[PDB]
UniProtKB/Swiss-Prot annotation:
Location relative to the cell: Cell membrane
Residues of the full protein shown: 1567 to 1594 of 1840
Protein name per its UniProtKB record: Sodium channel protein type 4 subunit alpha
Similarity annotation: Belongs to the sodium channel (TC 1.A.1.10) family. Nav1.4/SCN4A subfamily.
Domain note: The sequence contains 4 internal repeats, each with 5 hydrophobic segments (S1, S2, S3, S5, S6) and one positively charged segment (S4). Segments S4 are probably the voltage-sensors and are characterized by a series of positively charged amino acids at every third position.
Assembly and oligomerization: The Nav1.4 voltage-gated sodium channel consists of an ion-conducting alpha subunit SCN4A which is functional on its own and a regulatory beta subunit SCN1B. SCN1B strongly enhances the presence of SCN4A at the cell surface. SCN1B is also required for rapid channel inactivation and recovery after inactivation. It prevents the decrease of channel activity in response to repetitive, high-frequency depolarizations.
Length: 34
């Protein structure tokens, strides 16, 4: 349904977001290092 789904939708943005934030820090470092 369309209610009861906001924590689960929010967890999927958050779960996407931790990898994305960490990757932008490591792959900026590798570009910079090179």
């Amino acid at each position: 349904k369309k209610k009861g789904i906001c924590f689960f939708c929010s967890y999927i943005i958050i779960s996407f977001l931790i990898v994305v934030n960490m990757y932008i820090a490591i792959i900026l470092e590798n570009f910079k290092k090179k």
